[PDB]
Amino acid sequence: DLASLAIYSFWIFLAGLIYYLQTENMREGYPLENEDGTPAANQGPFPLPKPKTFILPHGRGTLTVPGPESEDRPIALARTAVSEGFPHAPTGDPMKDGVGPASWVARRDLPELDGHGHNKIKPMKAAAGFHVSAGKNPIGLPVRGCDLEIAGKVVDIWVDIPEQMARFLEVELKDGSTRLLPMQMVKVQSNRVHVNALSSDLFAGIPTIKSPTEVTLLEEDKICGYVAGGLMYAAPKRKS
Amino acid sequence: ALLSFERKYRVPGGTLVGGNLFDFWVGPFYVGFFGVATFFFAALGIILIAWSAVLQGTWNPQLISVYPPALEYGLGGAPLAKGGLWQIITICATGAFVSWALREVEICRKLGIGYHIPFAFAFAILAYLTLVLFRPVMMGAWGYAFPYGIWTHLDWVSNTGYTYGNFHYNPAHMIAISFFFTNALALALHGALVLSAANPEKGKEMRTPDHEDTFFRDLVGYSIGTLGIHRLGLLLSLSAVFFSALCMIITGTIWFDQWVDWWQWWVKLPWWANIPGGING
Amino acid sequence: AEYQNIFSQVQVRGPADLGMTEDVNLANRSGVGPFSTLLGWFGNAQLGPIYLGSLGVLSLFSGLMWFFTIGIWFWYQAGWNPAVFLRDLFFFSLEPPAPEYGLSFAAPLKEGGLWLIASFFMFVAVWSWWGRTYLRAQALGMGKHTAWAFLSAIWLWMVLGFIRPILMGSWSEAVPYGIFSHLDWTNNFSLVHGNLFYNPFHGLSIAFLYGSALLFAMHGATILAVSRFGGERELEQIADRGTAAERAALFWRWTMGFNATMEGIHRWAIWMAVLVTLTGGIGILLSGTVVDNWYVWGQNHG
Ligand code: BCL
Ligand code: BCL
Ligand code: BCL
Ligand SMILES: CC[C@H]1c2cc3[nH]c4c(c3C)C(=O)[C@H](C(=O)OC)c4c3nc(cc4[nH]c(cc(n2)[C@@H]1C)c(C(C)=O)c4C)[C@@H](C)[C@@H]3CCC(=O)OC/C=C(\C)CCC[C@H](C)CCC[C@H](C)CCCC(C)C
Ligand SMILES: CC[C@H]1c2cc3[nH]c4c(c3C)C(=O)[C@H](C(=O)OC)c4c3nc(cc4[nH]c(cc(n2)[C@@H]1C)c(C(C)=O)c4C)[C@@H](C)[C@@H]3CCC(=O)OC/C=C(\C)CCC[C@H](C)CCC[C@H](C)CCCC(C)C
Ligand SMILES: COC(C)(C)C/C=C/C(C)=C/C=C/C(C)=C/C=C/C(C)=C/C=C\C=C(C)\C=C\C=C(/C)CC/C=C(\C)CCC=C(C)C
Ligand SMILES: COC1=C(OC)C(=O)C(C/C=C(\C)CCC=C(C)C)=C(C)C1=O
Ligand SMILES: CCCCCCCCCCCC[N+](C)(C)[O-]
Ligand SMILES: CCCCCCCCCCCC[N+](C)(C)[O-]
Ligand SMILES: CCCCCCCCCCCC[N+](C)(C)[O-]
Ligand SMILES: CCCCCCCCCCCC[N+](C)(C)[O-]
Ligand SMILES: CCCCCCCCCCCC[N+](C)(C)[O-]
Ligand SMILES: [Fe+3]
């Protein structure tokens, strides 16, 4: 019967499709590892797929995956138990060391570029002719931390030019230097910007950027990870 | 047992209950208090389903069916073999789903991410609870809930629907279906868009989000953008489930007649009710 | 309250974005529409530009002709009365020829001929719009994933209105043009084929429809949860994995014991979706051509 043939065939097709899809999703993070970095004995029933290569725009190279995996950074953690499957305690300050929820990845230390090869993200002051078009303008507002102290003041918005969206607030600190705060981690209010993730004293420790008019993917990861990490690591100095 | 980038994230903390007591993994799986609760609820639930299969006298997965108490029991307990097992399996299931969501919250806290995932899942739980708890309570009997069986749950959907004529005429059902269809359409388009940019024509460089905006604007004159589309898909699919639960909470309670006749209010409006011609005059 | 990224707190605007050139014939692009502050709370404020082109003009014109052919019939059914039109809007129906005309085009205007005309305009509107999804990707150097996904929807459409009718031997099998009447057609199709709940392809179609909502709920929620690390910049995370993509993956690994990549999730996405109308179209195509009664079929297991 043609319908039973069709249904039987579909189940075979679907097994192959799931196989294809699962292997496609193993182009990163594999092979699996033991807690010390070495290849784990058990890799599971799915083999790695044949490598594929992406051509990156603006002469930035290619990416081939799967490929050799490495963290390319020290991980200030250590075991807390004698067997597999337990947590790894920070060896220093987990905010400073970039571990746990404060983690960052070693992405390329260049800025993301738009389709024309210009920097994707710019301070609004350098983006012609971008301006706040709706909602409360954060520029000028005092910035408050989860300890209810003023950490600084907003001096600009970092905007995504091609996508016309606000990505960071540039906040100036007591010493005249600035930090980027992720837009998704601030609450803009009528009389302040509030930052639940960080107490006021942790603002100086936000990873700085090396050029004051651009930000690299690497710098972005360090800033975002640092701010998110405060949720767990600033919890003691917070605060109903 | 660990992805190549995983170890830096496996720190202590984030748990809701128990401190470090259950703060550990089993292979890839995080555990936590709610991993223990999930296991307890799920295991008891499956044991009880298997017990129900023994009392029904079959092991065929296409035949096993656990029915709620008959209508005559109302909202009280029933003998195990006559709807009581269903009652306990339902407590177990709810236990398991809520445990699962709460374990998800623990995982969010460890990972320093937003709570969006367990929030979205709660909608699914609410829809389940609408069918097995809220609606049956409002209607006065457990027996209006669906049975736990692969084919029998489908008999229930059919019998329940036809109790009101063609269920297509439920207006909240109509909105719900529209969100479902629109969600699937958006899923197809999101998936296709990202892939069409990451995997361009042979030999060409990866396209940018700018190309993605350009393509959709070229096509339909608008682009929701990259944050927009993930907001969209979340909204569409949660709205589908909200209106799914709505469409049923109102059926057998505030409306209990044939849904087709609900639409008469529009036709019977004074200013055109009596004009001849058309389909209704 | 932690801010949730459902609606933007602050909108910013710059010069109207005219988009990427690549191989696009720029003569065929409109200018920018207005900017909707309303839309801009949720997505992009900018409207337009759009791309015209001959195919686009054909498609759109043809699509309106389809729409107007149905509206004309609706007005006629209302006896030209505006008040009856609005009152009975969902009750009107442009219906296919009777079985007796078979597949012929010899049916009278009022008894099927107008249905065929409307159908004709829909046919060219849809297919020319498909060619459009291909060509807009081509001119931009992009993959053809959109046109390929669109073909899955077209498949169900074609099966319902064209392929299944031709195979059954008459246009009377096709779907009527009407709000309520398309629903009645749907209910009646199931009834006449012994209950679609016994069609394993209808059941797969549902698994994927539900599946699409599960997955987009999952994916959408995930991206939003990691948007504090730039998660929605999916293409640069594919090209250069960040902590967004790693926390995303690990959420799911810790929860359900496996996970995706930033590129691979979008492959799960496209397939979960296209399989709705793919299995769907097969379930319908087989109905009446090969299987008269799905309950009966299911008793023989096949
Ligand atoms: C003949 C039958 C009637 C009909 C009968 C009714 C009835 C009755 C109902 C619907 C409802 C549905 N119908 Mg109807 N309706 C029919 C015609 C249709 C048509 C159509 C094209 O003809 C469509 C598209 C729909 C679509 C709709 C949806 C809006 C809705 C189901 C989605 C849902 O509730 O999700 C919600 C999601 C859930 C309930 C799942 C949640 C589960 C989670 C929490 C837990 C599961 C995890 C665990 C068990 C997994 C196992 C563990 C393993 C490790 C995996 N109907 C016909 C006319 N319809 C239903 C509804 O709205 O209910 C609310 C409903 O009760
Ligand atoms: C949602 C509205 C209606 C509904 C109407 C329909 C209709 C109509 C159909 C189904 C069908 C499905 N329904 Mg139902 N059914 C509902 C209630 C549910 C609930 C629940 C609330 O707990 C569950 C677990 C199921 C699960 C089932 C699956 C057996 C099947 C595929 C679903 C799917 O791919 O989803 C999408 C989600 C995924 C893709 C994730 C995969 C998880 C699935 C496979 C879970 C399977 C669990 C099942 C075997 C329960 C065993 C639990 C164990 C004892 C632990 N239904 C309510 C009553 N359901 C289809 C079928 O063919 O059934 C025969 C079908 O045509
Ligand atoms: C009483 C009704 C019957 C039944 C009748 C049928 C029938 C008949 C069918 C389905 C089909 C489906 N049913 Mg059913 N259905 C029932 C029970 C249900 C229930 C439930 C009880 O909970 C559910 C969840 C489902 C849900 C489903 C879907 C999985 C599926 C349609 C997928 C889709 O995306 O189509 C929507 C997608 C399309 C229609 C394709 C769109 C094509 C493009 C080209 C459209 C062009 C648009 C353009 C011209 C218009 C422009 C206007 C704009 C403003 C621009 N059914 C009961 C048993 N069901 C379909 C199927 O495939 O089944 C196998 C189908 O034919
Ligand atoms: C709200 C929008 C959509 C949605 C959202 C959603 N679902 C989700 C998630 C979210 C965001 C979760 O993060 C969670 C997940 O981990 O995903 C993999 C989940 C999930 N959705 C799932 C299933 C599911 N969701 C459904 C659909 C939907 N989910 C909506 C369409 C459906 C449908 C449409 O029927 C199904 C079947 C699971 C894969 C997963 C939750 C897994 C879980 O809670 O595990 C804990 C419990 C067990 C391992 C099993 C317990 C066994 C019971 C004690 C006994 C069984 C009783 C049962 C009632 C019998 C059913 C018999 C059937 C034949 C009817
Ligand atoms: C799993 C498959 C799912 C799916 C996917 C899908 N659909 C597709 C495609 C894909 C990937 C697209 O590429 C394509 C698209 O371009 O989307 C943006 C599309 C599409 N699916 C659409 C709708 C649609 N899809 C369906 C759903 C689904 N599609 C499935 C759920 C359904 C349902 C659920 O019934 C609907 C109705 C369209 C938005 C679009 C196809 C566009 C098209 O074929 O147009 C042809 C006709 C016209 C150009 C005009 C139509 C007539 C209008 C009534 C006129 C009124 C408006 C007019 C445009 C005003 C402007 C005039 C002025 C100049 C005066
Ligand atoms: C205000 O009034 C005005 C005048 C402006 C008009 C207003 C418009 C109104 C009120 C009309 C509303 C339109 C409606 C209600 C349409 C809805 C129809 C629905 C719900 C469609 C659903 C199903 C459609 C399907 C499946 C159609 C499939 C069609 C095909 C696959 C094409 C088949 C091709 C055929 C038969 C022609 C063969 C031709 C060749 C190639 C030889
Ligand atoms: C990351 O890319 C994404 C966007 O950003 C560039 C989008 O703009 C869109 C397109 C958004 C629309 C208009 C959804 C279509 C659904 C309806 C309601 C017709 C998609 C698909 C996408 O993936
Ligand atoms: C329909 C969805 C089915 C998906 C379930 C199977 C995939 C999970 C197995 C992947 C193996 C995980 N591993 C060992 C590679 O890490
Ligand atoms: C309450 C539902 C009964 C649970 C049955 C256990 C799920 C097994 C999945 C069905 C597989 C059917 N099969 C292929 C073995 O025949
Ligand atoms: C499916 C979404 C539909 C989007 C609507 C299309 C808006 C395009 C407006 C472009 C026209 C600009 N204008 C008026 C200056 O010519
Ligand atoms: C993208 C692939 C995900 C796979 C989803 C698998 C769902 C299986 C549901 C079983 C359907 C049973 N039935 C009756 C339709 O044959
Ligand atoms: C259809 C749902 C069936 C559940 C299957 C879920 C697949 C998860 C596989 C995880 C196994 C992990 N590991 C490392 C032990 O292989
Ligand atoms: Fe995405």
UniProtKB/Swiss-Prot annotation, chain A:
Family in the record: Belongs to the reaction center PuhA family.
Transmembrane intervals: 2-21
Function: The reaction center is a membrane-bound complex that mediates the initial photochemical event in the electron transfer process of photosynthesis.
Quaternary structure note: Heterotrimer composed of subunits L, M, and H.
GO cellular component: plasma membrane light-harvesting complex; plasma membrane-derived chromatophore membrane
Cofactor(s) required, per the database record: a bacteriochlorophyll; a bacteriopheophytin; Fe cation; Mg(2+)
Keyword vocabulary terms for this entry: Bacteriochlorophyll, Chlorophyll, Chromophore, Electron transport, Membrane, Photosynthesis, Reaction center, Transmembrane, Transmembrane helix, Transport
Topology of this chain in the membrane: Single-pass membrane protein
CDD domains, per the entry: PRCH
Cytoplasmic side, ranges: 22-240
Tree of life domain: Bacteria
Signal peptide positions (record): none
Free-text comment on the cofactor: Binds 4 bacteriochlorophylls per trimer.
Pfam families the record matches: PRC (PF05239), PRCH (PF03967)
Name of this chain's protein: Reaction center protein H chain
Main location, first listed in the record: membrane
Disulfide bonds: none
Compartments, as annotated in UniProt: Cellular chromatophore membrane
Family matches, as InterPro entries: Bac_photo_RC_H_C, Photo_RC_H, Photo_RC_H_N, Photo_RC_H_N_sf, PRC-brl_dom, PRC_barrel-like_sf
Gene: puhA
Curated annotation (Swiss-Prot), chain B:
Pfam families per the UniProt record, alphabetical: Photo_RC (PF00124)
Function: The reaction center is a membrane-bound complex that mediates the initial photochemical event in the electron transfer process of photosynthesis.
Subunit structure: Reaction center is composed of four bacteriochlorophylls, two bacteriopheophytins, two ubiquinones, one iron, and three highly hydrophobic polypeptide chains (designated L, M, and H).
Sequence similarity: Belongs to the reaction center PufL/M/PsbA/D family.
Record's bilayer topology term: Multi-pass membrane protein
GO biological process, one term: photosynthetic electron transport in photosystem II
GO cellular component, one term: plasma membrane light-harvesting complex
Residues passing through the membrane, by range: 32-55, 83-111, 116-138, 171-198, 225-250
Binding-site residues, Fe cation: 190, 230
GO molecular function: bacteriochlorophyll binding; electron transporter, transferring electrons within the cyclic electron transport pathway of photosynthesis activity; metal ion binding
Binding site for (7R,8Z)-bacteriochlorophyll b: 153, 173
Ranges per topology, Periplasmic: 56-82, 139-170, 251-281
Covalent S-S links between cysteines: none
List of residues binding a ubiquinone: 216
Keyword Magnesium listed: yes
Protein name: Reaction center protein L chain
Subcellular location: Cellular chromatophore membrane
Keywords, comma-separated and alphabetical: Bacteriochlorophyll, Chlorophyll, Chromophore, Electron transport, Iron, Magnesium, Membrane, Metal-binding, Photosynthesis, Reaction center, Transmembrane, Transmembrane helix, Transport
Cytoplasmic-facing ranges: 1-31, 112-115, 199-224
Gene name in the database record: pufL
From Swiss-Prot, chain C:
Pfam families to which the protein is assigned, alphabetical: Photo_RC
Residues the record lists as binding a ubiquinone: 252
GO CC annotation terms, alphabetical: plasma membrane light-harvesting complex; plasma membrane-derived chromatophore membrane
UniProt superkingdom: Bacteria
Keywords, sorted A to Z: Bacteriochlorophyll, Chlorophyll, Chromophore, Electron transport, Iron, Magnesium, Membrane, Metal-binding, Photosynthesis, Reaction center, Transmembrane, Transmembrane helix, Transport
Cell compartments where the protein resides: Cellular chromatophore membrane
Subunit structure: Reaction center is composed of four bacteriochlorophylls, two bacteriopheophytins, two ubiquinones, one iron, and three highly hydrophobic polypeptide chains (designated L, M, and H).
Record family assignment: Belongs to the reaction center PufL/M/PsbA/D family.
Protein name: Reaction center protein M chain
